[PDB]
């Protein structure tokens, strides 16, 4: 577990369920941890934003599109990104996040060329320009679990 500060752990990889969904495309292997919790960068929380690790041969990168500044249940704090995954034929990743926006759910798609290139082990909230995402809707759609399967 990386530390945000002294005696202040940044993440909780225990019981993160890494390997709950595995998807492979050619020499690419994508695995995710839907029960990965992450502490907010504003205060001391424990929010299950989910994270994925991608291996394209030698390089291993992290992918947490729900680990953002959009915190709390109202945002992507309980997104559990990587609950379900799949690959397209044009090297785009399809990620499902059932807990986003008070469990309205969200689908996030990023180009594999951008995932590895914009990866930075010192940046915990990476913003991707070619990101495609289902934005938040009205409150009637809460508790819908969009992204449960893909």
């Amino acid at each position: 577990n990386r530390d945000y500060a002294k005696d202040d752990p940044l993440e909780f990889k225990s019981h993160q369920w890494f390997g709950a969904s595995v998807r492979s495309k050619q020499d690419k292997i994508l695995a995710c941890a839907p029960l990965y919790h992450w502490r907010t960068e504003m205060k001391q929380e424990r929010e299950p934003v989910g994270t994925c690790f991608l291996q394209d041969g030698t390089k291993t990168v992290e992918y947490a599109p729900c680990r953002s500044q959009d915190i709390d249940a109202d945002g992507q704090g309980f997104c559990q990104g990587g609950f379900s995954i799949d690959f397209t034929k044009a090297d785009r990743v399809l990620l499902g996040g059932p807990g986003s926006f008070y469990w309205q759910g969200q689908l996030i798609s990023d180009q594999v060329a951008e995932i590895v290139s914009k990866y930075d082990p010192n940046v915990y909230s990476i913003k991707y320009n070619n990101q495609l995402a289902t934005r938040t809707a009205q409150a009637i759609f809460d508790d819908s679990y969009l992204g449960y399967s893909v």
Partner: protein, 272 residues
């Protein structure tokens, strides 16, 4: 010698005191009261009267029935005209429950509006206003703020306001909270709605909202001049310096009225 019964003289003086402030002769019946159920609604009343560490007559010796009323949420009327902004904060109340806790405007004794602070650090200054003509706002009081690292509970004596609200049949009232104006914005964090908290816990996020604490006299009570005898009444006594002291070293003044207290004060005497 004195003895320790002095404590028992206080207890038996407390006994007759509580009964007199409640205008009671004997304790009421508790066989018409159900043992066990104690609502957390009256526990919030009792907790809010003991809470005030912050904030600034013949009828004033008797007891006052303490009741409170919560405010109106932002889900009905507080968003239709202004909503919330960095310039002001609005709180709204009804009157069908204000004139229900205190039916007659005269019964109202003290009415303090209490809020809930959040950590604010160094300094802020707050000015309070009242709703006039349903559109104009009039100044009330002001208060400087201290660096409380913890949530703080305040109170503002708006008794003169609430009394005027009980005399009119005005079906809607409310307050306004802006900040100081240095002339020749607002940075206070008070417990609010935040607008966006949802889920199962959202319902409890309306608790601790600004409420108006009321202390009135029950309707059941209603209703040297109180004595024909020379009671402990202050007696007249004019003292001259040249006449009663013989001191010519004091030029001014040359006399004043230094009264005195004469009369007994006993208790628990024979015969209600």
């Amino acid at each position: 010698i004195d003895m320790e019964l002095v404590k028992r003289k206080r207890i038996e003086a407390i006994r007759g005191q509580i009964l007199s402030k409640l205008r009671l002769a004997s304790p009421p019946s508790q066989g018409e009261v159900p043992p066990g159920p104690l609502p957390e609604a009256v526990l919030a009343l009792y907790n809010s009267t003991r809470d005030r560490v912050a904030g600034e007559p013949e009828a004033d010796y008797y007891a006052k029935e303490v009741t409170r009323v919560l405010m109106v949420e932002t889900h009905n009327e507080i968003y239709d005209k202004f909503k919330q902004s960095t310039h002001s904060i609005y709180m709204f109340f009804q009157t069908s429950e204000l004139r229900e806790a205190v039916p007659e405007p005269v019964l109202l004794s003290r009415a303090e509006l209490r809020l809930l602070r959040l950590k604010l650090k160094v300094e802020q200054h707050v000015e309070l206003y009242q709703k006039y003509s349903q559109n104009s706002w009039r100044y009330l009081s002001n208060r400087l703020l201290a660096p409380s690292d913890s949530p703080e509970w305040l109170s503002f004596d708006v008794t003169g306001v609430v009394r005027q609200w009980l005399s009119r049949g005005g079906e809607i009232e409310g307050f306004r909270l802006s900040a100081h104006c240095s002339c020749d914005t607002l940075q206070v964090d008070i417990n609010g709605f935040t607008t966006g908290r949802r889920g199962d816990l959202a319902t409890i996020h309306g608790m601790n909202r600004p409420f108006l604490l009321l202390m009135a006299t029950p309707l059941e009570r209603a209703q040297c001049f109180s004595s024909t005898e020379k009671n402990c009444c202050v007696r007249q006594l004019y003292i001259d310096f040249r006449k009663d002291l013989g001191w010519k070293w004091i030029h001014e003044p040359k006399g004043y009225h230094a009264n005195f207290c004469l009369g007994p004060c006993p208790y628990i005497w024979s015969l209600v």
